[PDB]
Amino acid sequence: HMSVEIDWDNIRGDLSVNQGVKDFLNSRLQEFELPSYVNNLKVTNFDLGTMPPNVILKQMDDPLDEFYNTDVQLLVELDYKGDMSIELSADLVLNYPSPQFMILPVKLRISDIGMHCLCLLAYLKKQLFISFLCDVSDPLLENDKLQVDPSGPNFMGKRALERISLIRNIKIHTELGQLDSVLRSVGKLEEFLVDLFRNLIRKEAAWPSWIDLD
Numbered sequence: 001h002m003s004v005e006i007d008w009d010n011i012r013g014d015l016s017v018n019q020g021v022k023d024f025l026n027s028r029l030q031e032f033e034l035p036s037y038v039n040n041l042k043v044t045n046f047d048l049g050t051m052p053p054n055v056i057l058k059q060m061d062d063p064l065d066e067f068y069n070t071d072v073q074l075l076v077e078l079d080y081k082g083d084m085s086i087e088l089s090a091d092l093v094l095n096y097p098s099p100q101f102m103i104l105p106v107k108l109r110i111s112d113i114g115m116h117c118l119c120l121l122a123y124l125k126k127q128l129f130i131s132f133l134c135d136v137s138d139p140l141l142e143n144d145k146l147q148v149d150p151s152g153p154n155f156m157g158k159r160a161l162e163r164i165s166l167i168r169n170i171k172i173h174t175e176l177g178q179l180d181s182v183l184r185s186v187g188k189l190e191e192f193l194v195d196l197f198r199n200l201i202r203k204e205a206a207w208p209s210w211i212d213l214d
């Protein structure tokens with residue numbers, strides 16, 4: 001309906017939004033069991049990209065009850081193709097040739113995150129909630145089996161459980177500092193982390209959950 005410009009420079013520099021996503025991510029990390037090849041997983045940096053998402057404002061409403069004018073809630077399409085990153089640190093546990101033969105601290109960066117999602121942004125009491133709804137190309141939308149009008153008789157019904165991936169692409173890069181095999185275990189950790197991050201966004205940033213920022 002209507003495109004919205006966005007001051008990425010202002011957003012990219014707000015120290016409270018950056019800490020805030022780090023707070024969200026680390027707090028949600030503590031619910032994830034870590035397998036034998038990793039210890040002490042934490043998000044240590046977060047960098048918004050150079051580029052904003054394209055944003056199309058579809059609708060405006062009073063925020064839904066469950067988030068509890070001048071309170072407001074936007075229904076938006078985010079088309080994000082930028083270069084945002086998340087840095088994680090961890091201890092890589094090598095279990096070859098013996099169990100815990102060696103432990104190496106490593107740094108990983110999740111980046112190249114591609115999404116094209118319907119999303120809610122609820123502003124109330126100086127707070128912003130961000131709740132990803134579903135990919136814009138989810139078949140449930142074309143088939144009219146999922147309703148995404150928050151005002152809104154059948155908003156996000158039982159069929160939302162069959163939602164497709166919210167994340168269209170994602171890369172993880174491990175930085176070296178590990179001349180010391182190691183790469184087999186890094187590969188297991190890369191795979192583990194992509195899956196973890198997918199699951200954390202799905203379960204904690206997507207309706208009926210959301211990211212709560214100040």
Ligand SMILES: CCCCCCCC/C=C\CCCCCCCC(=O)O[C@H](COC(=O)CCCCCCCCCCCCCCC)COP(=O)(O)OCCN
Pocket residue numbers: 004006011017021025048053055074078080113115121123126128130201211
């Ligand atoms: C693991 C996931 C990591 C990334 C998770 C999301 C982190 C996104 C980072 C920050 C959220 C965006 C900050 C939005 C700034 C708040 C809105 C704003 O200033 O622009 C407001 C108008 O502009 C808008 O509508 C903002 C729309 C931008 C939404 C951006 C959403 C971020 C999307 C990131 C791409 C998705 C990648 C997610 C990766 C999993 C003006 O506000 P106001 O009513 O004049 O005053 C209210 C004062 N609070």
Ligand SMILES: [K+]
Pocket residue numbers: 034035036037038039
């Ligand atoms: K472990």
